[PDB]
Design a protein around this ligand. Structure first.
Ligand SMILES: C[C@@H](NC(=O)CCc1nc(=O)c2ccccc2[nH]1)c1ccc(-n2ccnc2)cc1
Length: 350
């Protein structure tokens, strides 16, 4: 039986469950696919590797010796086998190294979730329908001529301004099973905004299945600029840089989420939050650029900051764009999924 899902929904299913994309992501990370094939990735393995990174982070902090640190570095590579060819395995002895390996584990985790989902279960059904249902998400195509489509394109167009233009191909209205009920206690909080979240295409089967998640306790808290939360932006330029597109594959996926921010703890610099101050429900990283606040609109009771980029007054800040971080997964209600085309082209700075 052939699926009766619209072709954009079917094409999305194939895109996010694509096994060759999962293998390609691991090769770019230089993981040894012979010692550690796709099907041997596990949650405990990845958690064990995070803990080693936390131990490395504390070895630098406590002035550990070279032998101490090298043995930890080798434990990581025994757990997650890499193939560096001629090259020596990089030593995990600095905050930069552990931050790169932390980000790789973040992405390897969503690949494990996707591949497990794809191989779990059972026929007579179209496999595209079978795998749609595994996502436990209602996925609808938004009409290109609707007003919500026009607002979403305006949000993309206004908040983008580095060597590429963005083209919205498809807009999906999404509803993760159970997420609305989980979000309800926070629908009452004030300061709810519609924000961007970009990620690699290999993460979206996990994102739809399990929602946006917080890094686990084993992960190094110094791996995350503002601590272990869920990160959003108010400008598509910031989020789109996480889509991991290229000349060979110029199509990415990006989310629009309703985020209940409440009272924002405003920071200009990194802070490894493990608990918010009393009275604060979120963090706002202040950027030098902000969408023009006189152009805000309200789409279904949620503020949508689609103003064109203007300068904020903020000085001595390390961020070009605003960032919003919440530390409770229930503060997020995913609303739209966009398939974006990256049209790469240079243009000099005026
Ligand atoms: C640090 C944080 N990094 C990201 O979420 C990367 C994508 C991203 N997209 C944006 O649009 C964005 C907009 C603005 C700022 C940052 C932004 N980062 C994080 C959160 C959770 C985990 N984690 C690990 C295991 N389980 C969950 C990993 C990383």
């Amino acid at each position: 039986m052939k699926s009766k899902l619209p072709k954009p929904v079917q094409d999305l299913i194939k895109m996010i469950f694509d096994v060759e994309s999962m293998k390609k992501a691991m090769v770019e990370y230089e993981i040894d696919l012979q010692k550690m094939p796709l099907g041997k990735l596990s949650k405990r393995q990845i958690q064990a590797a995070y803990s080693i990174l936390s131990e490395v982070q504390q070895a630098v902090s406590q002035g550990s010796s070279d032998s101490q640190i090298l043995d930890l570095s080798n434990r990581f590579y025994t757990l997650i086998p890499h193939d560096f060819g001629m090259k020596k395995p990089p030593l995990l002895n600095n905050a930069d190294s552990v931050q790169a390996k932390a980000e790789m584990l973040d992405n390897l985790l969503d690949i494990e979730v996707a591949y497990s989902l794809l191989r779990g279960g059972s026929s007579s059904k179209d496999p595209i329908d079978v795998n749609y249902e595994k996502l436990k998400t209602d996925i609808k195509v938004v009409d290109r001529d609707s007003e919500e489509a026009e607002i979403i394109r305006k949000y993309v167009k206004n908040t983008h301004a580095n060597a590429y233009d963005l083209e919205v191909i498809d807009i999906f209205k999404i509803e993760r099973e159970g997420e609305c009920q989980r979000y309800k206690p926070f629908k009452q909080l004030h300061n709810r905004r519609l924000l961007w979240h970009g990620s690699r295409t290999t993460n979206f089967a996990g994102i739809l299945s399990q929602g946006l998640r917080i890094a686990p306790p084993e992960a190094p808290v110094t791996g995350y600029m503002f601590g272990k939360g869920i990160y959003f932006a108010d400008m598509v330029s910031k989020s789109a840089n996480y889509c991991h597109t290229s000349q060979g594959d110029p199509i990415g996926l990006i989310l629009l989420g309703e985020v209940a921010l409440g009272n924002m703890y405003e920071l200009k610099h990194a802070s490894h939050i493990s608990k918010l101050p009393k009275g604060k429900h979120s963090v706002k990283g202040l950027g030098k650029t902000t969408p023009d606040p006189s152009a805000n609109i309200s789409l279904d009771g949620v503020d949508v900051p689609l103003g064109t980029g203007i300068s904020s007054g903020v000085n001595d800040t390390s961020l070009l764009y605003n960032e919003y971080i919440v530390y409770d997964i229930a503060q997020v209600n995913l609303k739209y999924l966009l398939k974006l085309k990256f049209n790469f082209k240079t243009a000099h700075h005026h």
